[PDB]
Each structure stands twice: as C-alpha cells, then as structure tokens.
Amino acid sequence: VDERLKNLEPKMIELIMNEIMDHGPPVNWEDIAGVEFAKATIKEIVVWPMLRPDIFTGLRGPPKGILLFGPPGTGKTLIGKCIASQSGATFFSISASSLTSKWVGEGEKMVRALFAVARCQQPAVIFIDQIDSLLSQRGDGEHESSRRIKTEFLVQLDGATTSSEDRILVVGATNRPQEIDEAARRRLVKRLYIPLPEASARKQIVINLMSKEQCCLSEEEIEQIVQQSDAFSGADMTQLCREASLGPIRSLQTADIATITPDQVRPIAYIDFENAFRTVRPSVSPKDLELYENWNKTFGCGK
Amino acid sequence: VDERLKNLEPKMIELIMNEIMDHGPPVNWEDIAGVEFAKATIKEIVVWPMLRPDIFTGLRGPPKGILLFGPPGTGKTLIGKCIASQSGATFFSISASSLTSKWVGEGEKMVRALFAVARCQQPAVIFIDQIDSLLSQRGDGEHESSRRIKTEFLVQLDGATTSSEDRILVVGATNRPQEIDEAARRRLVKRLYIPLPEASARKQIVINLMSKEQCCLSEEEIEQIVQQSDAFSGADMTQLCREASLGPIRSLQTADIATITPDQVRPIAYIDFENAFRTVRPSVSPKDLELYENWNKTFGCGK
Amino acid sequence: EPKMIELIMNEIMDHGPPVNWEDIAGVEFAKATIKEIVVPKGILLFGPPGTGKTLIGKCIASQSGATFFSISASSLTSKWVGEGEKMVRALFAVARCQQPAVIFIDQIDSLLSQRGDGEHESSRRIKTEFLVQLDGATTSSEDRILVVGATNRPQEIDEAARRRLVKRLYIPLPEASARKQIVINLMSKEQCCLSEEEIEQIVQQSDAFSGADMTQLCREASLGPIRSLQTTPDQVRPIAYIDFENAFRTVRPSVSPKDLELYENWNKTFG
Amino acid sequence: VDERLKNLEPKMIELIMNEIMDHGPPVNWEDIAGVEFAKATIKEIVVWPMLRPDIFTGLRGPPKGILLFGPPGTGKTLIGKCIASQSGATFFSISASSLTSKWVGEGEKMVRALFAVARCQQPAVIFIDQIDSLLSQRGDGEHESSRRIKTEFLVQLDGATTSSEDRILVVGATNRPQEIDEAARRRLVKRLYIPLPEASARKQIVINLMSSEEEIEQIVQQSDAFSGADMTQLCREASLYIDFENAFRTVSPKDLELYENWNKTFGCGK
C-alpha cells in the first residue's frame, strides 16, 4: 500500500528496509534459563494473540511497549533474540546510529519512515538496544536534534494519527532505567526486571550448556559447582564453562595440538571446574544492585 | 559481498581503512621479557584458533575482548605491538581522535563503520590505547555525544546481529581501570594485570639491551645492577641503559667530537652504570600501586 | 508548486472511531471553555503525561466537523535552506483557504522553544515565520481559524510566542468521581457484575492514577479471567473484585510527585 | 535606551524583568508603626530628593545604600514594602538563590544584567533580603563562584565605570551583621537597627490589628520582648477579653546583646 508511504522518499525507505534482521540460528524459550514470570508475560503478550486473535482483540488486545531493565549480562538480548525467532514476524534491529543524521531535520524523517515501514508490515516487532541513548530525560540545555527526535518518538508511539489494531511492538532494553524520560516511560507499560540468576537458574544454565559436550558429572559435584558460583551473572556462567572446557587442552603436553586426534581428549571433570573457579570472578559489583530494587518497587510491573 | 558496506558511506570507509597500521619493525615474544602468564594466555587466545580452527570452534572459541591494566611503562603497548606483528592478521590502531566528530551523528557512525570494515578483513584485531577516555562510566549529566558513542560501542561488541563466529578481537590498555563502565567491563572478559618487572625480568631486559651494544660485563656486575635497580619499570630500565650508553662519549675529550673516531670509543663498562644510577630515579611512586592490587584481587583473572 | 502543496494537503486528519465529550469526564472546565469557543486565537494545554490532551484533540477532530491538521516537527522541517518558511506559509494559506480550519500541534516545544545559545538560523526563521503568520491571520479576523496544541513542559515556551497563545489550560489528575466514571464507561461495554461498594473501594485504592494508568488497570482486570483458565467466549468468568485485586498487584503509578509543585505554581502564575 | 543593553544576553534581560514585582496593596508608614528614628532617616533619604530635586542634587544627594540589622520578625520587609509603594520607583527584589546557578560564570552575568536593567530606569529600589548570605566575609579558601559574585557586586556598587547621578538605592536586610564583609559594609553607609517593638508600639499594633484603657494597659504590660510576628500570630489565634488572656497564656535575649555592641560600633543611631 503505497498510499501510507506516499510522502516518503525512496532513500529513507531503503535504510529502514535493509535493517531487518534475517532469521538466524533458532532459539527456544527453554533455551532461556532464568525468570519464569517474564517468560510467561512475554508469551501471553506475543504468542497468544497470534494463535487466537478473535478472542484477544479489542480491549484484551496486547499492549504496545515493553521495557527490560537489570544489571549487565542478565540475558535481555537473549530474550530479544528468542522473541525475534519465535514471533514469526518482521523484526527490526534499531540503534542510535540508524536514526541520527548530520543534516537538519532528518532524524524526525527517519523516525517517521521507520514507523511507516513497520506499519506496512504487520505483525512486526521493533527492538531497540540501549534505549537510554535515544529516549532520555529531556535536559534544560540540549541540541534541537535530540529534542525533535524524542518528540517524534513520543508522537509516533502515542498520537492522534496513531490508532489501535496496529500489530507493532516496541521493545527496549536498558541498564539505567531511571534516566528514561517520564513521557517515554508512560508508553512502556510493561516493565520487567531481570536480576542475577539463582541456584536453580545456574543449574539449568550449566545443564543446558554442558549437555552439548560429552562428559560425566556427579550430582553432588554439580550441586557443589552451583553453590560455589555465587553472585555470578548469566554471562559469568558461560565464561566459567568456557574456561573449564580449555582445561583438557592444557592437560596435554606441548606440540601435541598440531597432530592430536579429536578423540584423544579427556572429558571434562570436576577438577576442570575447580581450576576454572580460580581464574573467574563475578563481573558485577553488588553495590550497583541497590538502585535497581529501589526502582523496581517504585515502577516495576512484577509481583 | 559488498552488502556489508552497502549502508556505510564511502568516506567513512576510507577514513577507517586509513587507520590500518603498516608493517612496522618486527617484534617477537622473546623481546618482551617479564610477565609470563599474560603471554601464555595471549598465545592461547590468538595462536591456537588459526592452527586448528576445527578443534577450537564452538564452545572453545576465543573471547572477543581483552583488557590490560597496570602502572605506566609496563609494556602494555609493547604487548599490543607484538600481538600485531605475530598475530598475522589485520591490525587497526584506533584512538579518541579517530572517532570523535563535531558534526552531530558522525560519532556513532564512525564506530559502526569501523566494526563493519573489521568484519570484512577477518581475522582482525582492534587495539584501543587509553580506552578509559572512550568508555568511561556513564555519568548523569554527560553530553549526548559521549552517551551515544558508548552505547554504539556496547551494541557493536555485543548485540543481536553479531550471531557469533566473528573473528574480531578488541584489545584495550589503560592506567585507570576503575573508571571503566561495568557494561563495557563485562565485554572485556580477560583482564590482565601487568606489574613492574621482577629480578628475572630486569636481568633479561639488561641482557637484551646490552647484547646489541658490545660490552664486557661479568655476572657479579649484572647481579649488582639488578640488585640496585629496585622499583624500576621497563621504561626506567631502558632509560638507564641509554644513559649508560653515553659514558664513553663523556669520557673522551670534547675535541674528539669533531674527529668522532667511532672505533676509539671504549666498550661500556660497569663504571658507566655506577655513574648512571645517580642521574636516574624510579618514575613510579609506590603510593599509586595499592589500588591496582585491590582491583586485581576483585576483578582480575590471574591466579 | 503542486508537489509542495501535496504534502500539506496530505496531512489532514482521516476518518476514525468516533469520540464523544462524555468520555473525558474528568476535566469539565476545560471542556466547557473549548466547546464555548469552538462553536482566543491560541489555546495551550499542559499537564502531567497521560492527562488526556491528545484525547481532547481527537474529540475536537471528530466533533467539530471541520478540517483537522496534525502537524509535527517532522513535517515542518526540511534540510533545504529557506523551504521551512515557505512550507509554513503554504500551510497557513491552505488553512485559510479551507474555512473553518483547526490546526493541532503536538509537542509544541519541538517546533518553538525558548531562545538558546547555539540555535540554528533555520529554526529561528521558522519560528519568526510562524509568529508573523499567526499575527497576520488573527488581526484581520475575516476568516475563522483555530490553533491548539499540547506540551508537557510549558516553561520552555518562549515569551514572544507565548503571548500569542492567550488561552492557557491545565489538566490535573482525574478525581474520584472522574475515576468512577471512567471505570463504569470502560467496563460497561463488557459484561460485568459488581456492587457500588466495590467501585468505591476501587476508587479509594486508585490514588494519584492518571487516565492511562486507569486504562491499563482495567485492561489487566479484563485479562485476569484468561489467566484464571487453564491452558469460546462463553467460558469467560464474569469479572469480579478478585480480578481488580490481582491487577493492583502489578499496577503502580507512572507519574512521580517530584514535578507536581512546578506544574501547580506555573498554572497559578500564568494558567 | 537599548544602546547601553547592547552587550547583554536577551534572556538574561527577560529574567531580570520577570524578577520585578507588580505594585501590591497600598501601605503607609503609620500602618507598620513601631519605628521613629528609622522612619525619619528613611523618609529623609528617599522622599526629599523627589519633592525638590534641584536643591538636593550635589554634595547633599542620596547616599546610595541602606542596611537594616535586627532580630527575626522585626518588620524589616515592611520597611522595604513601604518604600516600594510610596517611593514610586521600580522595585527589584532579589534573594540569595536567585543569583546562584549550576553553570560557571552565570552569577557575574546575572549581577551585571540586574544592575544594567536597574540602571535603565533611573529611579529604582533594589531590595536584597538575606544580604549576609551572598555577600559574606571572604575567607582564604572558598568557592570561586562566590568570590566572583562578591567582587562583581562590589565593582558594580563602586567602580571606575560607575558615575554619579545613578539614583539607584540598594536596601539590604540582615540578621547576622558581623558576617558582612568590610568592603561591602563600606558601601552601605546608612546602617539602621530595627529592635523589638516598644510598649507604645506594641499597644498600637495590638489595638489596630485586633479591630477598656486599663485592660489595654495591662495587656501591653504583660507582653514583653515579643516580636511583630508573635503579636500577629497571637492576635490571629485569639480572634478564632477572656479569649485574649487565654491566647496570651498559650526568641531569646541572650544573643541580642551582640546586636547592641554592633549598633554601638557601626550603627548610624545615637
């Protein structure tokens, strides 16, 4: 329908079109080991309307706007990848560089073109990573471009022209939610906090990541490994597993690498994890978490 | 396939391509005396993947980031140069001046173009010196340009579009690691502390520098030189050697300068070092070391 | 200049779902003023986010039965030098030609703001053109015209442009009666059964809740029954107070009390 | 007159103009009551130049500066309000927080713009409450911005550029006169003490605000060392003769001693 794109120049349309993320390796929900509540909420938001649009229309229609906040490396981008894979809808990977131009009065044009193209392909999902760069608190003194971009975003998300029944979803991920402008905060109704994994989450991550590699781990050894990994983040567990996987190679003598057969490698044992724990430390200081909780209870959407 | 560079402007591509370092003087791991764990881990990171990509592909793949920290003049840039020379891969030498731009929007586009270009010359190594200026902690009232640049760097290092299996390595060197953003800190998984040279390191540096310049030094003299030179860094040792090299020049009379007599100059002796000790002092005060130790104990990966 | 006028002509509001005055409920005085003046050249509406300003705009577009223009910063900004003023002139000429005309500006601060250092010449030229065109159109009073808009930060509107907008209105948060009216209006559409005491308790629970927050709470309450069912419409259980209790678990105010004093003092001074 | 405003930032001028307050309800000297020497001095300083400008111009002109020091709630703001209403001159009110700003150098620009705008209209009164805060003793170590603001204020009050015939009066009310810098103290040549109301003043205030002779005298005698604000609050709650006694049944003098000493040393009184 070129009518909705009548006042868009082709060059603007091309940049929006070429940003669509092609279908990569599949990712499933069970692949995400962590909070169950966020997964259930996202499923109810996205999958259910698609399966039964007739019953989940009108008032029960899914909301527009989701925010994901938490400490670094808690699997927000993994959730984005899973949504892109399972939604079966056009997925836009937007960033700050995409919508910023040196010429005067083109950022708003870029935002309008992006929203028009997204409306052309429905259902569609718009994912913005590090949304605090684009939508931030409007300071007293700032350049006109930033204010115009923010106002254009606010108008497009909510405005007179905007109407319901538009299967467009905006998902943002940030580590500093307190800096998001309140006007932008209103649009993002569903706020989701993703804290550090707990013992069960760590066990699930270890089982999922280690099942792909042949080895034998005792239940008590797995429990001890989970117990030791305290305050680790999602990426910390992956780094620990990677470090453990390199132990067998170090075990072999020098110069064997060039000609050693793949079979002649000892499987991963508990001593590998014991050695790995020495050289792996948590990447998030606890003192940084104090803020998030205070915000989660103030504006969070989780029970 | 040109689709990688289709979106980027040709001028940014040319500017990025202008940053590739030439084939400078050869440098090998032998020249870098001192730290041994750091060299071993760097070798494991860089050399092994190319020797047998099949073995190390997958969960055993190398990490995408490295960080080096320590007091000034401890060979961080020397390690970077050795990696560039021995890695056998395209080496980009980036700095703050190469990315910042007065025009609005070019700051993030420069980073995007850099990562796109590095994605075509795989394998590639991106070395950033004094990284604390580009990826400092995200302040509450910082300028929008800095926030956008940091966000773009974080997205490029880790994002949905990466899809793994990209042979791009980012290396950073800094003297103030405590100011690095946590979001960027987690990206640099392997953090290495490079302390001042030890007795063996100082002896090796002295031997290496005196091998080129013929001299007659006994074991006792070398032991005394090592004993006296305490708290010196690699730069201090090089300065001491250079100062001692001038001893023969000062010993001869001024009129000899017009005649030079290159063969007339005596070989460097121990009296030259004795005199050089007076005019050379350590350049690093102990009071600054404490902090580093704490950080190495909190976020370091060295056993 | 057919192409240039085409862009302006294509910004007229299109047909949409009807909107009625009774829906707004909460803000009676502003509605009275707007309905008295519609059937005072400049009207500015300000308040905390989610107070229904855009809802008022949509209601005016649907009810006034006149041409409605939705103009934003993106539409009136062009990179070419000198085209912004020409496009503003074309917009005003088209508005005057088709009478009566109503022009709605969302996020006015983007188009015109307090003068600041480093401002580009194009923005100043566009602002001056807007001011002169408004004054020229208003002084003669030969042709009917109305210009209204919305903005959440009225303190950034420049005094020079501020004086043109004689009418200033503030929309506070909804009142208990307004909250009850919104609840009954939104829930009466769907089959529901609740007592008056239940609605009073809901209103008491919902304190410092904006219209958007109330709508989200109602949507969550309506969704709750689906959560109740395990993995036809007749299977839906009637909505009860338990649904509202569950909804209150995950619904919290989205507007902080930090800047309320600023809005109150500005409204008292110039409102 | 815009020529002398060529180098000033227009937004600064707009802010300074917005700082001006429209004329309030009329007030008279008899209304406030309780001060006689202060009334005589202030009226001599302000009214006389207006009525017969020709004679007073020259060596016998206005002094360009007034200070009012005393305990809290002693009618200081009342004197400034009466001057603003009766003097018939543009009245500028400035507080301590008005000049301060986050950015560097904004205080000096604000002071310069304020003084220039006030200079645009020759007859004007600049009343600065809490003068002891922005203008304080300059210690060896302090914030750079405060030092810049103080020095700019001193230069504006006295400097090579400044010329006679300014006709700008600066009135400053303070409660801690010993914190005022000596350089700033020099500018405020006419320094007046505003003490607690006397028996006659208190009686007049109570009788006027409330709206037999023995009852009035007893009430006046009972009330001792009470400020104007205390009387206002007491009468307001009482109105909500026995009731007055009940309200009466419903500051400290130890510090006041210092004021006397200061009034003895630098005060303009006798």
Partner: peptide, 12 residues
C-alpha cells in the same frame, strides 16, 4: 560549576 560544548549542524 561546569562547562558545556556544542555540536554543529549542516543546513544546505
């Protein structure tokens, strides 16, 4: 007490 910079904008 802090200072700020500016970004240029091109309007051809």
């Amino acid at each position: 007490a802090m200072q700020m910079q500016l970004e240029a904008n091109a309007d051809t």
